[PDB]
Coordinates of C-alpha atoms and ligand atoms in Angstrom, one line a residue:
Chain A
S28 CA -79.3 63.7 23.6
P29 CA -77.9 63.2 20.0
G30 CA -76.2 66.6 20.3
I31 CA -74.8 66.4 23.8
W32 CA -71.0 66.3 24.4
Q33 CA -68.9 66.4 27.6
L34 CA -65.3 67.8 27.8
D35 CA -62.7 65.9 29.9
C36 CA -59.1 66.7 30.6
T37 CA -56.6 64.2 31.8
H38 CA -52.8 64.2 32.2
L39 CA -50.0 62.0 31.0
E40 CA -46.2 62.4 30.5
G41 CA -46.4 66.1 31.8
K42 CA -48.9 66.9 29.0
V43 CA -52.6 67.4 28.8
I44 CA -55.0 65.2 26.9
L45 CA -58.2 67.0 26.1
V46 CA -61.2 64.7 25.3
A47 CA -64.7 65.3 24.1
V48 CA -67.2 62.4 24.8
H49 CA -70.5 62.0 23.0
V50 CA -72.6 61.2 26.1
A51 CA -75.2 58.9 24.5
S52 CA -72.7 56.7 22.6
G53 CA -69.3 57.0 24.5
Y54 CA -67.6 57.9 21.2
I55 CA -64.6 60.2 21.8
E56 CA -62.3 62.7 20.1
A57 CA -59.0 63.7 21.8
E58 CA -55.9 65.8 21.3
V59 CA -52.7 66.4 23.2
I60 CA -51.9 70.0 24.2
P61 CA -49.0 71.4 26.4
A62 CA -51.6 72.9 28.7
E63 CA -55.4 73.5 29.0
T64 CA -56.0 77.1 28.0
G65 CA -59.2 78.8 26.9
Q66 CA -57.7 79.2 23.4
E67 CA -56.7 75.5 23.1
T68 CA -60.2 74.5 24.4
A69 CA -61.9 76.9 22.0
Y70 CA -60.0 75.6 19.0
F71 CA -60.8 72.0 19.9
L72 CA -64.5 72.8 20.1
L73 CA -64.4 74.6 16.7
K74 CA -62.9 71.4 15.2
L75 CA -65.4 69.1 16.9
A76 CA -68.4 71.2 15.8
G77 CA -67.3 71.2 12.2
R78 CA -67.2 67.4 12.3
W79 CA -70.3 66.5 14.3
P80 CA -73.6 68.3 15.1
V81 CA -72.7 69.6 18.5
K82 CA -75.7 71.1 20.2
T83 CA -74.5 71.2 23.8
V84 CA -71.2 71.0 25.5
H85 CA -70.8 70.4 29.2
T86 CA -67.5 72.0 30.0
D87 CA -64.8 70.1 32.0
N88 CA -64.2 72.8 34.6
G89 CA -65.1 76.3 35.7
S90 CA -62.2 78.0 34.0
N91 CA -63.4 76.7 30.6
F92 CA -67.0 77.6 31.5
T93 CA -65.8 81.2 32.3
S94 CA -63.3 81.6 29.4
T95 CA -64.5 84.3 27.0
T96 CA -62.6 82.6 24.2
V97 CA -64.4 79.3 24.9
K98 CA -67.7 81.3 25.0
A99 CA -66.7 82.9 21.6
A100 CA -66.1 79.5 20.1
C101 CA -69.5 78.2 21.3
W102 CA -71.1 81.3 20.0
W103 CA -69.4 80.9 16.6
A104 CA -70.2 77.2 16.2
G105 CA -73.8 77.5 17.6
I106 CA -73.1 75.4 20.7
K107 CA -74.9 75.8 24.0
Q108 CA -72.2 76.1 26.6
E109 CA -73.1 74.4 29.9
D110 CA -71.5 73.6 33.2
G111 CA -70.3 70.0 33.9
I112 CA -71.8 69.6 37.4
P113 CA -72.5 65.8 37.9
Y114 CA -76.1 66.2 39.1
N115 CA -76.2 62.5 38.3
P116 CA -73.3 61.1 40.4
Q117 CA -72.9 58.2 37.9
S118 CA -71.4 60.7 35.4
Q119 CA -68.4 61.4 37.6
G120 CA -67.7 57.6 37.7
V121 CA -68.2 57.1 33.9
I122 CA -65.6 59.8 33.1
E123 CA -63.1 58.5 35.6
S124 CA -63.5 55.0 34.2
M125 CA -63.0 56.3 30.7
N126 CA -59.8 58.1 31.6
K127 CA -58.5 54.9 33.2
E128 CA -59.4 52.9 30.0
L129 CA -57.8 55.5 27.7
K130 CA -54.6 55.5 29.7
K131 CA -54.5 51.7 29.7
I132 CA -54.9 51.7 25.9
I133 CA -52.2 54.4 25.5
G134 CA -49.9 52.1 27.6
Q135 CA -50.7 49.2 25.3
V136 CA -49.6 51.2 22.2
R137 CA -47.0 53.5 23.7
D138 CA -44.0 51.8 22.1
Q139 CA -45.5 52.1 18.6
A140 CA -44.8 55.8 18.4
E141 CA -42.2 58.3 19.6
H142 CA -44.8 61.0 20.3
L143 CA -47.6 60.9 22.8
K144 CA -50.0 62.6 20.3
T145 CA -49.6 59.5 18.0
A146 CA -50.3 57.1 20.8
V147 CA -53.4 59.1 21.8
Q148 CA -54.8 58.9 18.3
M149 CA -54.2 55.2 18.3
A150 CA -56.1 55.0 21.6
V151 CA -59.0 57.0 20.2
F152 CA -59.1 54.6 17.2
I153 CA -59.1 51.5 19.5
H154 CA -61.7 53.0 21.9
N155 CA -64.1 54.0 19.1
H156 CA -63.9 50.7 17.2
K157 CA -64.2 48.4 20.3
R158 CA -67.3 46.2 20.3
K159 CA -69.1 46.0 23.7
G164 CA -72.5 44.1 20.1
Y165 CA -71.8 47.5 18.6
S166 CA -68.9 50.0 18.8
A167 CA -69.1 53.6 20.0
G168 CA -68.5 54.7 16.4
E169 CA -71.5 52.7 15.2
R170 CA -73.6 54.0 18.1
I171 CA -72.9 57.7 17.4
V172 CA -73.8 57.4 13.6
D173 CA -77.0 55.4 14.4
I174 CA -78.1 57.9 17.0
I175 CA -77.5 60.9 14.8
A176 CA -79.0 59.4 11.7
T177 CA -82.1 58.4 13.6
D178 CA -82.3 62.1 14.8
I179 CA -82.1 63.4 11.2
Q180 CA -84.8 60.9 10.2
Chain B
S28 CA -69.0 53.6 -1.3
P29 CA -69.6 54.4 2.4
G30 CA -65.9 53.8 3.3
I31 CA -64.2 55.7 0.4
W32 CA -62.2 58.9 1.0
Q33 CA -60.0 61.0 -1.2
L34 CA -57.0 63.1 -0.1
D35 CA -56.4 66.5 -1.4
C36 CA -53.6 69.1 -0.8
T37 CA -54.0 72.8 -1.5
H38 CA -51.8 75.8 -0.6
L39 CA -52.5 79.2 1.0
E40 CA -50.4 81.8 2.8
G41 CA -47.3 79.7 2.1
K42 CA -48.8 76.9 4.1
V43 CA -50.4 73.6 3.1
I44 CA -54.0 72.6 3.7
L45 CA -54.4 68.8 3.7
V46 CA -58.0 67.7 3.1
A47 CA -59.8 64.4 3.2
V48 CA -63.1 64.2 1.3
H49 CA -65.7 61.5 1.8
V50 CA -66.5 60.9 -1.8
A51 CA -70.2 59.9 -1.6
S52 CA -71.2 62.9 0.6
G53 CA -68.7 65.6 0.0
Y54 CA -68.1 65.9 3.8
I55 CA -64.5 67.0 4.6
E56 CA -61.9 67.1 7.3
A57 CA -58.9 69.4 6.9
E58 CA -55.8 70.6 8.7
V59 CA -53.0 73.2 8.2
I60 CA -49.5 71.8 8.1
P61 CA -46.1 73.6 7.3
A62 CA -45.5 71.2 4.4
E63 CA -46.9 67.8 3.1
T64 CA -44.7 65.1 4.4
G65 CA -45.4 61.3 4.7
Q66 CA -45.3 61.7 8.5
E67 CA -47.9 64.5 8.4
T68 CA -50.1 62.6 6.0
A69 CA -49.8 59.4 8.1
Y70 CA -50.8 61.3 11.3
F71 CA -53.8 62.9 9.5
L72 CA -55.0 59.5 8.3
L73 CA -54.6 58.0 11.8
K74 CA -56.9 60.8 13.1
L75 CA -59.4 60.4 10.3
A76 CA -59.7 56.6 10.7
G77 CA -60.3 56.8 14.5
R78 CA -63.2 59.1 13.8
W79 CA -64.9 57.6 10.7
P80 CA -65.0 54.0 9.3
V81 CA -62.3 54.6 6.6
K82 CA -62.1 51.6 4.3
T83 CA -60.2 53.0 1.3
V84 CA -58.1 56.2 0.8
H85 CA -57.2 57.5 -2.6
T86 CA -54.0 59.3 -2.0
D87 CA -53.5 62.8 -3.3
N88 CA -50.2 62.2 -5.1
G89 CA -47.5 59.6 -5.9
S90 CA -45.2 60.6 -3.0
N91 CA -48.0 59.9 -0.4
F92 CA -48.8 56.7 -2.3
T93 CA -45.1 55.6 -2.1
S94 CA -44.4 56.8 1.5
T95 CA -43.7 53.9 3.8
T96 CA -44.9 56.0 6.7
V97 CA -48.2 56.5 4.9
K98 CA -48.4 52.8 4.1
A99 CA -47.7 52.1 7.9
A100 CA -50.6 54.3 8.9
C101 CA -52.9 52.6 6.4
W102 CA -51.7 49.2 7.7
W103 CA -52.2 50.3 11.3
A104 CA -55.7 51.7 10.8
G105 CA -56.9 48.9 8.4
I106 CA -57.2 51.2 5.4
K107 CA -56.8 50.1 1.8
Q108 CA -54.3 52.6 0.3
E109 CA -55.0 53.3 -3.3
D110 CA -53.8 55.7 -6.0
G111 CA -55.8 58.8 -7.0
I112 CA -55.7 58.5 -10.8
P113 CA -58.9 60.2 -12.1
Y114 CA -60.1 57.3 -14.3
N115 CA -63.4 59.3 -14.1
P116 CA -62.2 62.7 -15.4
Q117 CA -65.1 64.3 -13.4
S118 CA -63.2 63.6 -10.2
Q119 CA -60.4 66.0 -11.1
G120 CA -63.1 68.8 -11.7
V121 CA -64.9 68.1 -8.4
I122 CA -61.7 68.5 -6.4
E123 CA -60.7 71.7 -8.2
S124 CA -64.1 73.2 -7.5
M125 CA -63.9 72.1 -3.9
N126 CA -60.5 73.8 -3.4
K127 CA -61.9 76.9 -5.0
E128 CA -65.0 76.8 -2.7
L129 CA -62.9 76.2 0.4
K130 CA -60.5 79.1 -0.4
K131 CA -63.5 81.4 -1.0
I132 CA -64.9 80.5 2.5
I133 CA -61.5 81.0 4.1
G134 CA -61.4 84.5 2.6
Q135 CA -64.9 85.2 4.0
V136 CA -63.8 84.3 7.5
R137 CA -60.2 85.3 7.3
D138 CA -60.4 88.4 9.5
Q139 CA -62.2 86.4 12.3
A140 CA -58.9 84.8 13.4
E141 CA -55.2 85.6 13.5
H142 CA -54.1 82.1 12.5
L143 CA -54.8 80.3 9.2
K144 CA -55.6 77.0 11.0
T145 CA -58.6 78.7 12.8
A146 CA -59.9 80.0 9.5
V147 CA -59.6 76.6 7.9
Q148 CA -61.6 75.0 10.8
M149 CA -64.3 77.7 10.3
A150 CA -64.3 76.8 6.6
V151 CA -64.7 73.1 7.3
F152 CA -67.6 73.9 9.6
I153 CA -69.4 76.1 7.0
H154 CA -68.7 73.6 4.2
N155 CA -70.0 70.6 6.2
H156 CA -73.2 72.4 7.4
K157 CA -74.1 74.1 4.1
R158 CA -77.5 72.9 2.8
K159 CA -77.2 72.0 -0.9
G164 CA -82.0 69.7 0.8
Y165 CA -79.3 68.2 3.0
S166 CA -75.8 69.1 4.2
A167 CA -72.7 67.0 3.6
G168 CA -72.6 66.3 7.4
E169 CA -76.2 64.9 7.2
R170 CA -75.4 62.8 4.1
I171 CA -72.3 61.2 5.5
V172 CA -74.1 60.1 8.7
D173 CA -77.1 58.8 6.6
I174 CA -74.8 56.9 4.2
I175 CA -72.8 55.2 7.0
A176 CA -75.9 54.4 9.2
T177 CA -77.6 52.8 6.2
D178 CA -74.5 50.7 5.6
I179 CA -74.4 49.6 9.3
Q180 CA -78.1 48.5 9.2
Ligands
QCH201 C1 -42.2 58.4 12.7 N1 -42.7 57.5 13.8 C2 -41.8 56.2 13.7 C3 -41.9 55.4 15.0 C4 -41.2 55.7 16.0 C5 -41.2 55.0 17.2 C6 -41.9 53.8 17.3 C7 -42.7 53.5 16.2 C8 -42.7 54.2 15.0 C9 -43.5 53.7 13.9 O1 -43.1 53.7 12.7 N2 -44.8 53.4 14.2 C10 -45.7 52.7 13.3 C11 -46.8 53.5 12.7 C12 -46.4 54.8 12.0 C13 -47.6 55.5 11.4 C14 -48.6 55.8 12.4 C15 -49.1 54.5 13.0 C16 -47.9 53.8 13.7 C17 -44.2 57.2 13.8 C18 -44.9 58.6 13.7 C19 -45.5 58.8 12.5 C20 -46.1 60.0 12.3 C21 -46.2 61.0 13.3 C22 -45.6 60.7 14.5 C23 -44.9 59.5 14.7 C24 -44.3 59.2 16.0 O2 -43.3 58.5 16.2 O3 -45.0 59.5 17.0 O4 -45.6 61.6 15.5 C25 -46.4 62.7 15.3 C26 -46.3 63.2 13.9 C27 -47.2 64.4 13.7 C28 -47.2 64.9 12.3 C29 -45.9 65.6 12.1 O5 -45.5 66.4 13.0 O6 -45.3 65.3 11.0 O7 -46.8 62.2 13.0
QCH202 C1 -57.4 84.4 19.9 N1 -58.0 84.7 18.6 C2 -58.5 86.1 18.7 C3 -58.8 86.8 17.4 C4 -57.8 87.3 16.7 C5 -58.0 87.9 15.4 C6 -59.3 88.0 14.9 C7 -60.3 87.5 15.6 C8 -60.1 86.9 16.8 C9 -61.3 86.3 17.6 O1 -61.5 86.5 18.8 N2 -62.1 85.6 16.8 C10 -63.3 84.9 17.3 C11 -63.0 83.4 17.3 C12 -64.3 82.7 17.1 C13 -64.0 81.2 16.8 C14 -62.9 80.7 17.6 C15 -62.7 81.6 18.9 C16 -62.3 83.0 18.5 C17 -58.9 83.6 18.0 C18 -58.3 82.3 18.2 C19 -58.8 81.4 19.1 C20 -58.2 80.2 19.3 C21 -57.2 79.8 18.5 C22 -56.7 80.6 17.5 C23 -57.2 81.9 17.3 C24 -56.7 82.8 16.2 O2 -56.7 84.0 16.4 O3 -56.5 82.2 15.2 O4 -55.6 80.3 16.7 C25 -55.3 78.9 16.9 C26 -55.3 78.5 18.3 C27 -54.7 77.1 18.3 C28 -54.8 76.5 19.7 C29 -53.7 77.2 20.5 O5 -52.6 77.2 20.0 O6 -54.1 77.5 21.7 O7 -56.6 78.5 18.8
CL203 CL1 -65.0 54.4 14.0
CL204 CL1 -71.9 68.8 10.7

């Protein structure tokens, strides 16, 4: 489970926020894009996999699962591309709660930037640093380091 | 040591590649931007600090050191903004070699993408995964996890 990530797409201000969640820690990366295309999703995965040891990605929907550009990125970066079916129903609820948390944080910072992308990066920062006691950023590093050792 | 990063700006194809290097590990993050403005640099640092525990950033030049937008980002993200004077002359050589290495890798992948930004992310991936034995990606996680414990 140190290498497992889940994609998630949510909407705000007529734009799309694409999120990757490290399942075991709740650590996230996110970006704002005009729309959720295979190309945008592929590029996002390429970025993610250069930064963290991404073994498996559960895609956010069937279009990204099917996309040959997404499959090409997963091939390039050595990621196992998987579906995102919530065989465990709790997964569904966890993602929904996370999207609600993220949107709340974005609201709390929204007036500190003109552009949504800036607010989204502030929200990523707040989410990853929040102690719940360890933060998600601490959890992901500890999980991965333990795996290496 | 675990929290120290260095900014670096290099040019290719009439574009700018902005790089942050984690000093102790040699791990890097990078992006392609049209030109190196305070605003671009500020946004890059905001992204970086939401993803890694960035304590100190040695800026790449005097304009980014001076920039009130860069200072605002460092304030926001809790980063100590420092100059990049190579008091240790070896620093200057290390960055030079790294830019040369990165450009080499970009050349090796350049025909695998239309856009430079894609090639740059491929280069980041190859750089971070390269076993030198451990990779820079392994070293950064180990260094940070050891600090946490
Ligand atoms: C210029 N504004 C001024 C501003 C405008 C309105 C409200 C507050 C502030 C303000 O000063 N906030 C305080 C600080 C500023 C530092 C980051 C932390 C918060 C902030 C900004 C900086 C870099 C960006 C931005 C933006 C933006 O407004 O969203 O948008 C994307 C941009 C992308 C890179 C590119 O395209 O150059 O990078
Ligand atoms: C569409 N091309 C086709 C192509 C064109 C020329 C040569 C090879 C290939 C090719 O198929 N290479 C295989 C690679 C393997 C790794 C990544 C997946 C594809 C690749 C591509 C995908 C997403 C992008 C790109 C690009 C680009 O060409 O640079 O550019 C930035 C774009 C930004 C996000 C946005 O704007 O949507 O995301
Ligand atoms: Cl963090
Ligand atoms: Cl890595």
